[PDB]
Amino acid sequence: KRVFTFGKGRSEGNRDGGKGANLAEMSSIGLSVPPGLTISDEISEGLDYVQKEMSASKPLLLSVRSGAAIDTVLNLGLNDEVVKSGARFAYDSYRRFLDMFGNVVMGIPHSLFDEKLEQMKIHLDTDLTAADLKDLVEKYKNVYVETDPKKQLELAVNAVFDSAVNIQSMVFGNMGNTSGTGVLFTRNPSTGEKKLYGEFLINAQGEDVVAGIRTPEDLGTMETCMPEAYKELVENCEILERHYKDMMDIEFTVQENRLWMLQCRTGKRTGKGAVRIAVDMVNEGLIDTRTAIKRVETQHLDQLLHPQFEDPSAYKSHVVATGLPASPGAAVGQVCFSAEDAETWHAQGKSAILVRTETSPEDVGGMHAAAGILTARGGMTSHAAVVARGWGKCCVSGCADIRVNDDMKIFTIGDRVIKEGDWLSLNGTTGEVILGKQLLAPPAMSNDLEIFMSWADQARRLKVMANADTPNDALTARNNGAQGIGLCRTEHMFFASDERIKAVRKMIMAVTPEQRKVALDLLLPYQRSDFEGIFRAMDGLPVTIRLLDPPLHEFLPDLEHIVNELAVDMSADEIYSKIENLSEVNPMLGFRGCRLGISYPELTEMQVRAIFQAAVSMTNQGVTVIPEIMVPLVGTPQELRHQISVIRGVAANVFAEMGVTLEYKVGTMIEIPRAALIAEEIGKEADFFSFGTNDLTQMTFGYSRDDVGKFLQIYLAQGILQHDPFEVIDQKGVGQLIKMATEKGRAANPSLKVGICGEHGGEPSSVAFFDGVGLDYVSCSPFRVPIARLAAAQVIV
Amino acid sequence: KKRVFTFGKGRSEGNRDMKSLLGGKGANLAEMSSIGLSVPPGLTISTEACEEYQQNGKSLPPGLWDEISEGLDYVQKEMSASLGDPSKPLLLSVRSGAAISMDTVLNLGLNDEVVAGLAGKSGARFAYDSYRRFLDMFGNVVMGIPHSLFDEKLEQMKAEDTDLTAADLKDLVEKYKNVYVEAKGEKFPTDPKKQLELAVNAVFDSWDSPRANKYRSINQITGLKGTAVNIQSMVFGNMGNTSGTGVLFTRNPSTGEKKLYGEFLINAQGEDVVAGIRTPEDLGTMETCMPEAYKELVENCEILERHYKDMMDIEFTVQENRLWMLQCRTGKRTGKGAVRIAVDMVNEGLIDTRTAIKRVETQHLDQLLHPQFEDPSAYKSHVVATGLPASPGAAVGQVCFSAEDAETWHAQGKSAILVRTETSPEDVGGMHAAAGILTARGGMTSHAAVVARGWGKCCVSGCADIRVNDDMKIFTIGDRVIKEGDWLSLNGTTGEVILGKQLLAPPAMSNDLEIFMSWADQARRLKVMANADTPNDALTARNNGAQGIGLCRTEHMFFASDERIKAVRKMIMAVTPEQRKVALDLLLPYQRSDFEGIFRAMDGLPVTIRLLDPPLHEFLPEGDLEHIVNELAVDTGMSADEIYSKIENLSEVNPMLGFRGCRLGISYPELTEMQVRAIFQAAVSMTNQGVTVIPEIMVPLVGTPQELRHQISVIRGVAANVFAEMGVTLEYKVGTMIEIPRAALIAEEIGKEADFFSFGTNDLTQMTFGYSRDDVGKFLQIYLAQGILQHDPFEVIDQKGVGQLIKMATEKGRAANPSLKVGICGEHGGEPSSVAFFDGVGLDYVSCSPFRVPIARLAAAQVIV
Ligand SMILES: [Mg+2]
Ligand SMILES: [Mg+2]
């Protein structure tokens, strides 16, 4: 009921205390596990089983060990009548029984005992005679005042149970040279090499190996001096790996050439090791590909996709702040306070860590040139984070304990000042901000990562598309495994040059239809060109381009300076009147999305023309183009229907003008709650849906993605929210709308395709949800594609 | 009888149940004749005849004309006139008619012989003009000659219309008759019988024509044989002494007095009174001149009301002492006349109360809820501009250009019309004191419109053709200058801006309105609560029939004085918890006081108070950032740097989705503690004064159960402290707004922890559509014009989308908490079409602003009966 025994060949419990379950199963596979008991009078009944199995209860020294699902007293049960095996060994164990019994159970500090040993000593403990231990025994006895086995255990069990319990027979590693204790991993936890990786200490007690007082030996010397025990250890290691089907971290004790197994748990491993060990164990036939896909956590894969620091622990004393892990990866460079200086420094070969209070669309140039980005404000889904995550570039955002003073070209963290040019390192996986130039780990030249991902690719049901707005980004996406473009944000296709920025600002500020017509035609080349490069890069793959959904305030550059730059790039009155007419109290719910293409169909005409102008031109250059055109911010069937009418109108003109007719698809964003509520009406008129879970989450919760920081931390602290809904998909709420739209849209159009291009498309827990809803694909930024690929597979296998 | 059915005074071969055999019109003529009306005699050729005409090779079936002749003998006999006889001419109209919707030829039977007789009875010019028009219409509708070709003869003659003699028209007639030969090659038929025959054939031919079949095949009119032909005697009121035309309402359309109300002209045609060539007279002059005809008119009017059970608007003609009923439709009426007539017809036993509730339109009722102008038509010559009807009602006062001067003038007894380009929250004081508000910029949802509509105060907004110059104390409409102090009148129902001091209608001795509303109250299922934030407004609400307060917006409870605004700004600008505590203590008295006044006004009724949901930017001073920081330091005492830093920390990109609602009370529970304390301190204080207090505390902008749970914990904590301190324990309820889509998606979880739901369809609609309620105007007009939206979703509830969430939350919450009460306090609560929807969903009540309560009351009743 309460006590669970285990011994040679027998085992009441199984692997399904944390140790009690492992000791039981490890004992049932026939290994030399010292017999013992596992508490959940009964300890007496079990003590009879452990007694008979050991032929002692003929002294029987015991040990008590604590063990939870998620300290140890050794050599208990020894008195003067208890003390066959050797005097030095006995008195040594006795002296250790007094120290460990008094520190763990009684409560006397170990310092008071080390004082007596230091006073007695000689230069080494191994030089002490048996008589010296006798004197040390008496000295330890005097420390108590300054005996019954049954009571020793009672007080030992009560003490261990203060903060389940395990009592086991004693195997002695302190009998002499042919005895000891050791630890190992069955394979290298850093590199994954299939070679025993551990230590061993002759003539010492359990934790003396790792205690550090003495220096352990290498396993290679155990093979030389103790071949019988090492021969059985090798066999036992391959035994444990063969049973659990995984690399192991074990504890073992040798008692006069008699190998005893004590503890064994699954080995914690690095990203490199997780993959190499997974790949090898597959080649070895040990595990199938299903299990292998489970053995590499998304955090493992994430480590192998970006640069890493050699040893995070080795710089803990240099961390000056901790922010949000906006985009994973390590970065090292010199402090910089402006995007302009980043591009300049990068052009010269200097690595720049861009540090700012906040990034604007103007800084996209310098953000791409910086090795890493550090921002004081903004969340994980902020603009800087998405762009950084898409580039696989290190970013630490929301560093609240930093104040930037761009005028004085310095930033402070409390009372410390870090000046421009000082070397700074960022850890985008942990958010740590470290002073100085820290070590990077070397990239893996492993073909293993490629092989492993091919298993996940062949295993996943979901396709993984990419969110890329430029030809170069689209190429990177395909290199990372993207099966197409799920979202090309057309509004984000004018950041490159002053030429492009001037064109957009001409369109935004346009007042007369003559002014707008000039701008839309001036934009046509940029769209057709940029759209052209993507089609060929994704040759043979679907490309979903979305109509403009601009943040009007974002395209704007003192009020006079703003108006000044616009006139350079119309009359002062036209600009002042237009700035007044464009300002919105809540632009996130204002004049954007398809509301823009509907009010001004000439704008949608240019884009659609530029798309087919590029599609036909590239098809004529041998490219297989599979284009899709998607409408943003739809809430009614009329909105989509209205825009589709324009698309097909341009389709007729384009195909006839160029003498080539292409098949194309037309679809809609599902990022408005209403769109999902009447999705059966939209499904009839749409070829595909793509959930925009950024806006949808915002509309469902009423959370302004910009201003949510005012209270998200309080909501998280008080259990109101279990996650940032902008990071982890809300299954109860947002997910209900997703299921609704998916089921409704497919019931109306069985050939409907359904995807997700919101930021949750790249979040593992959300990917598993999308797979459950039965979505056809997910779409995420380029450097998140491999994560979604593995996530899309782990939920399947 | 078989194919030809005669009708007219004393004759009715058909009946009302023959809409498909006769025409729709042919069936009405048959019914009007049976109920005893003075119908000019005529005959209806059935649709069977048309079908036989189509199946007989586009020729009149045998034996049909002899029936048409027998029916002609009736009309001739009844009228003592004959086709073609100039001594006693008979002229016919020919109207087509099917069973439902799908041209007329007048004065058929007219030729050179007949016209001479018509000239002897009606006048030479009139006879030859009618002959002219007949040639045109008959030549076009029956012969196929376009009117465009006839206008050539007239233009050519006029070269060598109302300024043309009769001798000229007799010649112009000759030109028209030549158009027959010069176009169709054949001659104008002079025999009346031949004209009719041709007219009948042309009607049956018009049935199977293209465009005509396109209308049926496109729309898909199931099961239609053909058109009937309605041939009716013409009748003239310009035939001398004993003739005339008139119009009337069977009751006064302005007052509802049961008394014929109309005009009458002796020896004139219907269009003669419209053109205004002569001035009509009172029906009394008819009772004197033609006592018999008038006596017959009184009997016809009594038949009309008896048959139609309503007041009627008619056209009648007296031809030679014989009264003829030509037209009649339900008479339009004012609100005052709508109610009185409805009440009188109930007392009269002519209709029951169920019908009466359907007769008074919500728009009728609204006229009686605000001041009115005595006679709108009488000031058309003074209208200088028209804006948007932001808030209905009349207003009259002297022009003023600042909210400050409005309060001053009001305090002195002067009626002030506040004129501005735009109102800001600073102007609430003067806007409340102004008789009416006029703004040059802004839409129906603009600041002036929202605030004015809530007060039931007249407002005309968006008057784009006015420019206000408050410095020079003038505003202009083109070249006209309207100076400060000039008398101006506003019509917030029509948007009219009228110069001068116009007359107001006298107050009503309206016991009828009270009686009528008691019928609607006894009929409606929904309760109607009120949205009021002040004691007076809550008192106003109850006087207007409110059964309680469905929503008291606490954020709207500090516009009254500088003291209160200074207090709020101290809370907003608070940095340290010590600063905030000081501010909250300054607010506690104002909250407790107002809650006492509200509770006392609603003695015995439920009062739902909502926790703060403030627009932070709204409480900040207007003007340039420098002036704001200066004014805040004065009110707060903080340094210029502290204020600049705080304003920066308060700014939000999208405040409507930002740090507001319950997110504020959760982050700062001391705020919720102050409010809740003020509530129960007031509840007990009023309870000790004999007031029955039924308080409810509502949480705003809830999207999760934890948010509501968190705040309820605070409510119950303060309730215990207050009750213990004051030695009195009151029962209270705690509930939530359902104005976030997620709240409805997981409403089963929130229902377990809420006593009531109140749908906030303003935010809910906004979140559902993604429409910024402020900035939606950027594109709403285009969406409405292009059929994208059928309505402004902020005005009419979106049943497919927002309504789906309402049904969801209502059903989920009640399944989780059977004792849950469900209401609606969004602006749709006062919109008739939305009220009917809420009744269908099974909501328990609607809540709307005070002066909209009577509207929701009537609406809640009209959807039931
Ligand atoms: Mg979006
Ligand atoms: Mg609200």
Author numbering:
A (entry chain B): 2 to 17, 23 to 46, 66 to 82, 88 to 100, 107 to 119, 125 to 162, 167 to 191, 199 to 215, ...
B (entry chain A): 1 to 102, 107 to 164, 170 to 874
Give the text the authors published on this PDB structure.
Here, the rate limiting regeneration of the primary CO2 acceptor phosphoenolpyruvate (PEP) is catalyzed by the multi-domain protein pyruvate phosphate dikinase (PPDK). Previous studies emphasize that PPDK has a modular structure consisting of distinct substrate binding domains for PEP/pyruvate at the C-terminus (PBD) and for nucleotides ATP/AMP at the N-terminus (NBD, aa 1–340). A central domain (CD, aa 380–515) catalyzing the phosphoryl group transfer from ATP to pyruvate–or from PEP to AMP–via a phospho-histidine intermediate mediates a catalytic cross-talk between the distant substrate binding domains. Distinct conformational states resolved in crystal structures from maize and the non-plant organisms Clostridium symbiosum and Trypanosoma brucei suggest that the phosphoryl group transfer in the catalytic cycle is accompanied by a large swiveling motion of the CD from a position next to the NBD to a position facing the PBD (~110° and 45 Å).
The main difference is found in the NBD of both monomers with the A monomer reflecting an open conformation and the B monomer reflecting a closed conformation of this domain. Superimposition of the NBD subdomains highlights that NBD1 is reoriented by a large motion of about 40° around a hinge region consisting of two short peptide linkers formed by residues 112–115 and 195–200 towards NBD3. At the same time, NBD2 is displaced by about 40° to accommodate for the new position of NBD1. Yet, both monomers show electron density in the PBD for the co-crystallized substrate PEP. Besides, the NBD of monomer B exhibits additional density in both the mFo − DFc difference map and the feature enhanced maps (FEM, see methods section) probably reflecting a bound adenine nucleotide. However, since the molecular identity of the bound compound was not fully resolved at the present resolution, no compound was placed in this density in the deposited structure.
